[PDB]
Structure formats: structure tokens, C-alpha cells
Design an enzyme around this catalytic site. Sequence first.
Site, PDB file in Angstrom:
ATOM      1  N   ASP A  25       0.795  -1.211   0.000  1.00 21.39           N
ATOM      2  CA  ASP A  25       0.000   0.000   0.000  1.00 21.39           C
ATOM      3  C   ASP A  25       0.827   1.261   0.000  1.00 21.39           C
ATOM      4  O   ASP A  25       1.243   1.756   1.041  1.00 21.39           O
ATOM      5  CB  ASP A  25      -0.897  -0.062   1.221  1.00 21.39           C
ATOM      6  CG  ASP A  25      -1.990   0.951   1.300  1.00 21.39           C
ATOM      7  OD1 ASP A  25      -1.927   1.915   0.488  1.00 21.39           O
ATOM      8  OD2 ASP A  25      -2.935   0.813   2.096  1.00 21.39           O
ATOM      9  N   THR A  26       1.057   1.826  -1.181  1.00 15.08           N
ATOM     10  CA  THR A  26       1.904   3.019  -1.251  1.00 15.08           C
ATOM     11  C   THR A  26       1.245   4.255  -0.640  1.00 15.08           C
ATOM     12  O   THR A  26       1.950   5.214  -0.327  1.00 15.08           O
ATOM     13  CB  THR A  26       2.289   3.323  -2.699  1.00 15.08           C
ATOM     14  OG1 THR A  26       1.113   3.480  -3.498  1.00 15.08           O
ATOM     15  CG2 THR A  26       3.127   2.194  -3.301  1.00 15.08           C
ATOM     16  N   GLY A  27      -0.088   4.220  -0.451  1.00 13.81           N
ATOM     17  CA  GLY A  27      -0.801   5.284   0.205  1.00 13.81           C
ATOM     18  C   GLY A  27      -0.871   5.203   1.720  1.00 13.81           C
ATOM     19  O   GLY A  27      -1.486   6.078   2.355  1.00 13.81           O
TER      20      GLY A  27
HETATM   21  C1  LIG Z   1      -7.012   1.060   3.930  1.00 11.07           C
HETATM   22  C2  LIG Z   1      -6.802   0.644   2.488  1.00 11.07           C
HETATM   23  C3  LIG Z   1      -7.226  -0.838   2.316  1.00 11.07           C
HETATM   24  C4  LIG Z   1      -7.704   1.514   1.569  1.00 11.07           C
HETATM   25  N1  LIG Z   1      -7.410   2.941   1.652  1.00 11.07           N
HETATM   26  C5  LIG Z   1      -6.218   3.318   0.936  1.00 11.07           C
HETATM   27  C6  LIG Z   1      -5.018   3.621   1.823  1.00 11.07           C
HETATM   28  O1  LIG Z   1      -3.842   3.673   1.011  1.00 11.07           O
HETATM   29  C7  LIG Z   1      -5.143   4.886   2.646  1.00 11.07           C
HETATM   30  C8  LIG Z   1      -5.069   6.208   1.896  1.00 11.07           C
HETATM   31  C9  LIG Z   1      -5.171   7.433   2.746  1.00 11.07           C
HETATM   32  C10 LIG Z   1      -4.040   8.144   3.127  1.00 11.07           C
HETATM   33  C11 LIG Z   1      -4.202   9.206   4.037  1.00 11.07           C
HETATM   34  C12 LIG Z   1      -5.467   9.592   4.469  1.00 11.07           C
HETATM   35  C13 LIG Z   1      -6.603   8.920   4.067  1.00 11.07           C
HETATM   36  C14 LIG Z   1      -6.418   7.840   3.214  1.00 11.07           C
HETATM   37  N2  LIG Z   1      -4.099   4.895   3.653  1.00 11.07           N
HETATM   38  C15 LIG Z   1      -4.222   4.638   4.972  1.00 11.07           C
HETATM   39  O2  LIG Z   1      -5.245   4.283   5.534  1.00 11.07           O
HETATM   40  O3  LIG Z   1      -3.032   4.747   5.643  1.00 11.07           O
HETATM   41  C16 LIG Z   1      -3.051   4.430   7.036  1.00 11.07           C
HETATM   42  C17 LIG Z   1      -2.874   2.910   7.139  1.00 11.07           C
HETATM   43  C18 LIG Z   1      -1.484   2.722   7.738  1.00 11.07           C
HETATM   44  O4  LIG Z   1      -0.749   3.901   7.382  1.00 11.07           O
HETATM   45  C19 LIG Z   1      -1.733   4.937   7.635  1.00 11.07           C
HETATM   46  S1  LIG Z   1      -8.729   3.927   1.707  1.00 11.07           S
HETATM   47  O5  LIG Z   1      -8.251   5.318   1.705  1.00 11.07           O
HETATM   48  O6  LIG Z   1      -9.546   3.475   2.866  1.00 11.07           O
HETATM   49  C20 LIG Z   1      -9.704   3.777   0.260  1.00 11.07           C
HETATM   50  C21 LIG Z   1     -10.713   2.795   0.156  1.00 11.07           C
HETATM   51  C22 LIG Z   1     -11.386   2.701  -1.054  1.00 11.07           C
HETATM   52  C23 LIG Z   1     -11.046   3.407  -2.193  1.00 11.07           C
HETATM   53  N3  LIG Z   1     -11.743   3.278  -3.357  1.00 11.07           N
HETATM   54  C24 LIG Z   1     -10.058   4.377  -2.100  1.00 11.07           C
HETATM   55  C25 LIG Z   1      -9.423   4.523  -0.868  1.00 11.07           C
END
Ligand SMILES: CC(C)CN(C[C@@H](O)[C@H](Cc1ccccc1)NC(=O)O[C@H]1CCOC1)S(=O)(=O)c1ccc(N)cc1
Lengths: 99, 99
Positions: A25-27
Site C-alpha cells: 500500500d503506497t498510500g
Molecule cells: C485502507 C486501504 C485498504 C484503503 N485505503 C487506501 C489507503 O492507502 C489509505 C489512503 C489514505 C491516506 C491518508 C489519508 C486517508 C487515506 N491509507 C491509509 O489508511 O493509511 C493508514 C494505514 C497505515 O498507514 C496509515 S482507503 O483510503 O480506505 C480507500 C478505500 C477505497 C477506495 N476506493 C479508495 C481509498
Amino acid sequence: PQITLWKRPLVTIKIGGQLKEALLDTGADDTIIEEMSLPGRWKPKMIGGIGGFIKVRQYDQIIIEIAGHKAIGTVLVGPTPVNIIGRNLLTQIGATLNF
Amino acid sequence: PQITLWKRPLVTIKIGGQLKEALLDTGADDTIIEEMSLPGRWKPKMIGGIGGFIKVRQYDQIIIEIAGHKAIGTVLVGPTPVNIIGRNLLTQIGATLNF
Ligand SMILES: CC(C)CN(C[C@@H](O)[C@H](Cc1ccccc1)NC(=O)O[C@H]1CCOC1)S(=O)(=O)c1ccc(N)cc1
Ligand SMILES: [Cl-]
Ligand SMILES: [Cl-]
Ligand SMILES: [Cl-]
Ligand code: NA
């Protein structure tokens, strides 16, 4: 490997001698796994996701294998939809995004 | 290019005539942008993760220029804390994770 993104980039990790599935997960700034037993002391951490901020447990210097690649670093434990390998360990195994 | 993961992988995008900063996120199934107007039809959707779920509008067949590369697909619009380019559009620009 070179992993395309047509499906979720799920790999096998090994932590605590157990194999688990995790998402690369790069995000995600941080690595967070579902509830399990880890050794040592933990510290509190706030992390932000799509729905807002939550408090989780932070364990440092945890041994973890990611798709066969050895890492040792910070693993969070808390309510997470899937085990997530985030940038702190992606960087250790030398992962980059390319296009 | 080749993007390391020491810091968040942010790029400039153009969508609906507007320039925005967005995160290239291999963990996101679909692209989600902060509140903005887009043309055409939409339907409601819920998406969730860390911290729970948010209600978004789903627009289909939207063009987005991502770091110079054009791609078409579904774009979700709603109260996300960060603009995210998810797998549905990363595939179109030929993005891969390499290690
Ligand atoms: C949790 C994963 C499985 C899914 N997410 C993606 C992740 O990359 C998510 C992206 C993000 C970054 C910063 C703030 C808000 C969101 N990062 C995340 O939670 O970082 C946490 C986990 C540890 O480090 C910190 S999502 O945003 O829920 C999501 C769900 C559905 C769609 N269609 C698009 C996005
Ligand atoms: Cl670390
Ligand atoms: Cl799509
Ligand atoms: Cl391909
Ligand atoms: Na449309």
C-alpha cells in the site's frame, strides 16, 4: 517482482512464524496488521485513514518477511480492513513505483 | 519515472479543468478526489477503511491527466482527507510496483 495493479497487490508475509496475506500500500505511511501477539513494549500512535483518525498500538523493531524479503521495523496493530504493508517497510525492501 | 517511497508519492493531476495534488495509492481500489463538480451522471457509494466509511458520488468515464499521462475511468468524489489515484487509473498509466 514487477507487480501490476489490475488486482489488489496482495502478498504473503511472515510475522511471528505465521504466514498471513497483506496488501502492498503506497498510500499508507505505516504498516498495520490485524490483532495478533507481538513481543515487547508498545507505544500509542494516532493514524489517519479515509474515515478519520484512530489510535493503535505501535511495536518497534519487529522481524517481518514480505514476499520473501526480510525487514525489521515498526508494525502497528489495530482495527484495519486488511493487513497493510506501508511505506516504512516498502522502502526497506527497496520498492518503487514505476510508470 | 521511478518514485521512491521515502515520502508520500504525490503527483500533480488535472481533472475537470483543475490542477490538484494526489497520492498514487496501490492500496486504493478506486480513485477518490475531494469535493468538486464533475459533469454527467453519478450514483452514491460508500467506501471505507481506517477510521470507517464515507459517502461519495461515483462518476464514470472521467478523464484525468496524471503526471502527464491521460487516463479515463471512474472517479469518486467526497470528503476524503487526501486526493487519491487508485488502481483503476494506475493501471491505465502502466504503473507497477517493483522490488
Ligand atoms: C485502507 C486501504 C485498504 C484503503 N485505503 C487506501 C489507503 O492507502 C489509505 C489512503 C489514505 C491516506 C491518508 C489519508 C486517508 C487515506 N491509507 C491509509 O489508511 O493509511 C493508514 C494505514 C497505515 O498507514 C496509515 S482507503 O483510503 O480506505 C480507500 C478505500 C477505497 C477506495 N476506493 C479508495 C481509498
Ligand atoms: Cl520502520
Ligand atoms: Cl474505472
Ligand atoms: Cl499491464
Ligand atoms: Na459519466
